[PDB]
Amino acid sequence: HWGYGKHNGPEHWHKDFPIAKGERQSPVDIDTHTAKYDPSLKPLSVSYDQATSLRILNNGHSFQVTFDDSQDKAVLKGGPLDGTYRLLQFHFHWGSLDGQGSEHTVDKKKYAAELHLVHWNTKYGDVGKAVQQPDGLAVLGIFLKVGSAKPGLQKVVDVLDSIKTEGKSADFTNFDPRGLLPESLDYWTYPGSLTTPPLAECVTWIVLKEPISVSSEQVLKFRKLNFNGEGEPEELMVDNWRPAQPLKNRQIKASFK
Numbered sequence: 001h002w003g004y005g006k007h008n009g010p011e012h013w014h015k016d017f018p019i020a021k022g023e024r025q026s027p028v029d030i031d032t033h034t035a036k037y038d039p040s041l042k043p044l045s046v047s048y049d050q051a052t053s054l055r056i057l058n059n060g061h062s063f064q065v066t067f068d069d070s071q072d073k074a075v076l077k078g079g080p081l082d083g084t085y086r087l088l089q090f091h092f093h094w095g096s097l098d099g100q101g102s103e104h105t106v107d108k109k110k111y112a113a114e115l116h117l118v119h120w121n122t123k124y125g126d127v128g129k130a131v132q133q134p135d136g137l138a139v140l141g142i143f144l145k146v147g148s149a150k151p152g153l154q155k156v157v158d159v160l161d162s163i164k165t166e167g168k169s170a171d172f173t174n175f176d177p178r179g180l181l182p183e184s185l186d187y188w189t190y191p192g193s194l195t196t197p198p199l200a201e202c203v204t205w206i207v208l209k210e211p212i213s214v215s216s217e218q219v220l221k222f223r224k225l226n227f228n229g230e231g232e233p234e235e236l237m238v239d240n241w242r243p244a245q246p247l248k249n250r251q252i253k254a255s256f257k
């Protein structure tokens, strides 16, 4: 039922999901001058060498690459986190044009897109349990700007034609998510939520300062996806981002000076 249109979009979500008006919703605007450098924050540990991708799916809101999360292979640790978080899936949010698409903003600047690498805390055993906990998930957010192509994204781009409409999926094995990461792991962090229903307040957000560059041709391929199922009117999957939400009583911390 929920979506990104006039009648079912973000301004409507609170009716089915009242937590939409909660105390720790995401995304937020990152005011770079107000974020406090925190010298106690550790370097982020991203260990993706043994990642096992499984499938790629058009779920009607994004496309989603799923990983085998049944063992500690691809894990996120350190940074602001306590313990070990397993990589579950990644997906993107993007715009109709290059000047919008990101969920987080940086001094009100919107990027063309935002990549979410979604991890869950192994101390809760499974993602369904983890989403019921305030420290259950860690999402690594990476901004996309348009310029030079990202070679490590091309394998993703080249299969989107096969999952054009809602409910389509395909085999997507041997994808290496290290190819999606920028040089620097400098980050901002804050406590927040899922940015799609059920908007659960279970996420430690880790947003990298350095965007990746993707080509116009790569992002155009995102914008050829459809929100609709094949038996419904064609509606391009664009502008699948939630706008910035009130920061309320939260502090954004920087890992860097």
Ligand SMILES: CC(=O)NCCCCOc1ccc(NC(=O)Nc2ccc(S(N)(=O)=O)cc2)cc1
Binding pocket: 054, 066, 067, 068, 069, 070, 088, 089, 116, 118, 127, 139, 193, 194, 195, 196
């Ligand atoms: C062993 C095996 O074969 N495992 C394979 C996975 C099975 C479970 O699959 C899954 C896959 C996905 C989910 N839910 C989500 O990820 N919700 C979510 C919503 C919004 C955000 S964000 N980033 O704020 O926009 C992040 C996460 C649950 C179970």
Ligand SMILES: [Zn+2]
Binding pocket: 091, 092, 093, 116, 195
């Ligand atoms: Zn997301």
